[PDB]
Amino acid sequence: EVETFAFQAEIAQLMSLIINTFYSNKEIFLRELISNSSDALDKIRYESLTDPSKLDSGKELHINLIPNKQDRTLTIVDTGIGMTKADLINNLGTIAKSGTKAFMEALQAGADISMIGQFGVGFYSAYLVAEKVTVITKHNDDEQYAWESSAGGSFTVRTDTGEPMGRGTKVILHLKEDQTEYLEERRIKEIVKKHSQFIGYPITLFVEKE
Ligand SMILES: Nc1nc2c3ccccc3nc(Cc3cc(O)cc(O)c3)n2n1
């Protein structure tokens, strides 16, 4: 049973700005997804200190970067805290409303798109490089879900039946035709080194077969 939802007006507006504005420094999307993974990893590590049974769904805390030239996808996987159904549909959209507002005003005052993380809405920077985004996520005490959007004002949420994942979040970027430089090992390494060199979790860059 696939449910279809409208984005809140401000998020739709932000997504259009991101997709439509001329801005050549697209590489910052990666820093933002890795930073989101790090925050979700911090959250489950904190919670596990007062309740050790929260790591029964997996003890390892890490990030995998997985490019696939065949599918033309870049996948970021973390074993962070995960998201509930209520996160995917309501809560995250609600929190982002004020950050979007402030970000959009700041851009009029001479700030640039690369400052998006400072406003808590870095996730939407994925649309700099991706025509479609899919998020598979599993939170303790709740089922696995798939969220998906190609923008255009809507997103979908369903119960996920694919490979079960224990706990955490997997973001799948279906890249735009002219953005395949981000499947190259060398380019990905250069970007991680420049923008994400002090993340406190191991980051494994998978190599492709062919
Ligand atoms: N601010 C924000 N908005 C979202 C979001 C919106 C729609 C669907 C999924 C979403 N997930 C996240 C958090 C997130 C992003 C991420 O790239 C990795 C994670 O472990 C968690 N945010 N974080």
User: Which residues share a beta bridge with 146?
Assistant: 136, 158
* Ligand 1 atom with the shortest distance to the CA of 96: 1
- Experimental technique used? X-ray
**Mutation pick for ligand 1 pocket among 63, 94, 123 (CB with most ligand atoms within 8 Å):** 123
Resolution in A: 2.3
Range(s) of the domain holding residue 130: 1-210
End-to-end CA distance of the chain: 35
CA dist., res. 13 & res. 122, Å (int) = 15
Residue 131, classed as helix, strand or coil, is strand
Q: Which residues line ligand 1 (CB under 6 A)?
A: 33, 36-37, 40, 78, 80, 83, 88, 92, 96, 120-121, 123, 135, 147, 169, 171
- Cα of 34 vs its chain's centroid, Å: 8
CATH number of the domain that 121 lies in? 3.30.565.10
Residue 151, classed as helix, strand or coil, is coil
CA dist., res. 194 & res. 186, Å (int) = 12
- Total domain count for the chain? 1
Query: Which residues precede a break in the chain, with C-to-N distance above 2.5 Å?
Result: none
